[PDB]
């Protein structure tokens, strides 16, 4: 094309951290032990003690290139290891401290990893798999002092040494997937990914991050870098409070008030948990104004909960693959005009697609599906910091595309033409029945509009041909129909023969929970083997 | 060697934040008022499509990758879709300044090449008087519905809907000239990567917080640093533009403000000043605004007073020029609200703070920075995805642009402290090197327009040491005093040449010490 006269320069994880020790030096970075004590630093001094930490990790013969595990929870030697490692053009490989022993030998030597730094507490599980290491050659406690045979953070630091800048699109860090597949993938990560992830979820229809705001980043560091939540943090100048392992209620509520929290980031089980405490306590968080929820899709009811209490909720969808973040969720002004119960129901949708990113619902051959809220298709994805294969695995790397180039995450959804995306639980809902999805809480929430159906609830069972099919259990409203009638309900509804119950059995009560909800999981094993398979 | 990633090939490309935007938030609207003063009504869907349509307008008359193509003209919907379809289609979108002369116009657009020239009606005269000395523009085209003989319309021009053909991101995606430096005007070009990067980076809470809930009236014109980028980042978040075209006068500011709901603007010193005159003399107050930035001539501290007084943030900004874009952004650390009202009000009128993915340092002569006092001069120097390495066609612009280690020499001369805040000074040249010291001549003029005798005061320096042409008339005693307060010769007049026209004054008084 035409040159342009822009200067050739490369985005870089470290520019985020001398940024903040040179206009945002003095802000906090707090952090709780698993002691329970609680640590308090600087930016200033994280950079300082980073250069050092780059330094003593060269001293170790780590270079440009190389991989550095953790095995650690959120504090501030965490921090200094998410910009030394890329800060010195090695690979930072975020190991989760809660896998299997064996899972984690596999990932830690399929890394090769070169150097592993982990927590005090994480000794035991480190010395059992340390047999099994074929790579690590020196291993770090992530304190002041360490057992024989085991090295001290504080001591493996040594002179401070300059950055060494690596091409943009050169990597950073990388995680391996889990329960998934089944067997652990790599994806590696780009300084020019996460510097762009950064900037693009912090915006205001985003995580909104700013200098002036106390982030608390509940999501750990091991997963998918946090949300990129310490990085992006650091970006802005943000006080951080790292909570350490300690996720408990009281445990949090300490941090939240005690150091005056805005803006945090946790999966639905800490939330739900803290929810409990906060309601029986009748205690609230003074300070914290947003909250965002990632992982398992938050329940209505969560979000509620929160912003009864004055906490706005955001959720985010993002693969411990490809993208951390690519979906954020938030009211689009004409929206605003709902009722409280639309918007709840808005809000409780995975959200809509942040920038940089093109997202859409398509089928098998990669064409999009309706956007009526109804028809499923798979999230294909494209943009700056989603993976285009796997480290080391042939097999999955040449099936992770489209012809056309987007990545398949396997999650399948439903979209509308607001633009909103809402993922759908590919377990406790849908049934895949011959390479095609079905939702079972489309076709029960229908059929309880019939009248002669005071409760349904539908199910994935078991099919010789096609992998599942629907079941129907019906609780009649006096005269129990007929599985025509009920068809015939179905097909007034828009569902087309294909997806219809294959079959409608009959009771006086569905198993509820604790919450009330249909207890699909006994049904499932009931009719287990209902139609031969 | 460093290991590879698994992120796929992507390019960043300005083309998605309209494509995003028809997706996401196509009914947002795009409002509009003519030269006519008529206002015209529009949306993202409909922006998206008649823009893919320009595409294939712009290919039927020769246009390609790399082609540079321009404009002559203010802020309005169709300056909107062109700022999509040439860089979407690989073009280059070379934006004219219509307040230059037409010399000056003509050379940069014979410099750039331009192949097809895009201007609003009202500059037809201006177009039809300088025909004759453009050597490549092939095609003129009419902003507007209608066009004379000789002339194409632009809703003629365009064509068949057409799909954007993207390009490396550190292709080029439009281009700018200097101008007032006293030699060729300077051509910078920028990179689709650049303009991303730059509409990210400046958006943030900290900078200008665009969310698609805004209502956001660009009054910095589309033909000087992008309008702030404020088209494409206010594309990028779906929030709903209102272009007031070329009536930049207070009453007709307030219509569309009120009348729209405008809550984000951005705009030059004098149009804001005229806009706290109006405002204070009515006393009629604007309802939705919430957010103003001003960029360009460093904004006074009482015109940030006069806005905040009626609840509006002021927020400054520095890079309202091609050389050195939007690169400082003000903004009042958290540590720092506890400031007394002055205090903070003087550090809302210091320039501001470096924002992000920006590297900058305020240095000597030997790129060496200098100390962080609030004192110590030393000129401005960056580094960044949007900072220019060189210039278009000029091997001596470009061969001293930057210094040693490779950072742009911005020419301008500032201080800078420990919490970070850049503060621009006098500019490079005009500066006062006397004796191995040195003394803003900015600084001193500013002090002395200060006192009641002194209407306009311009400082220069003369061969030897400053001088004051000053315009009853003060002693130099009075002035002298005014400004021992505050922190040779002074010779008068009863205006001083225009565009502070200092080259002319050096020459003037060029031995009026010897």
Known sequence: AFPSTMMDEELNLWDFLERAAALFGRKEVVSRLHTGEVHRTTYAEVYQ?????????????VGVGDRVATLGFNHFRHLEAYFAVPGMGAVLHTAN?????????????????????????????????????????????????????????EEALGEEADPVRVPERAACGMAYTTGTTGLPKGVVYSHRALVLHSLAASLVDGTALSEKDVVLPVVPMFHVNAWCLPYAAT????????????????????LFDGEGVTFTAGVPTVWLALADYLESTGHRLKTLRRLV??????????????????????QGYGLTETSPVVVQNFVKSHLESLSEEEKLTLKAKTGLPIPLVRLRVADEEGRPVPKDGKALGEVQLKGPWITGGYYGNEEATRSALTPDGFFRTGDIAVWDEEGYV???????????????????????????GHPKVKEAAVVAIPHPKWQERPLAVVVPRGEKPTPEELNEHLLKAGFAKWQLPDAYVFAEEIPRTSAGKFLKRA???????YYGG
């Open 49 to 61: 003690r980073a250069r050092r930490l780059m330094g003593g990790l060269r001293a170790l013969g």
């Open 97 to 153: 401290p809660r896998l299997s022993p064996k899972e984690i030998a596999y990932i830690l030597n399929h890394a090769e990893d070169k150097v592993l730094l982990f927590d005090p507490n994480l000794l035991p599980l480190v010395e059992a798999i340390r047999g099994e290491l074929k790579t690590v050659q020196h291993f770090v406690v992530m304190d002041e002092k360490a057992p024989e045979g085991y090295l001290a953070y």
């Open 235 to 254: 970006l802005v100048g943000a006080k951080q409070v790292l909570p350490g392992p300690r996720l408990d209620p009281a445990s949090l509520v300490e």
């Open 293 to 314: 929820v990632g992982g398992s899709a938050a329940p209505r009811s969560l979000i509620a909960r929160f912003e009864r209490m004055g906490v706005e909720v955001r």
């Open 422 to 448: 809402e993922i759908k639980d590919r377990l406790k809902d849908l049934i895949k029945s011959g390479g095609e999805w079905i939702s079972s809480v489309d076709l029960e929430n229908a059929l309880m």
């Open 523 to 529: 049904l499932r094993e009931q009719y287990k083997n």
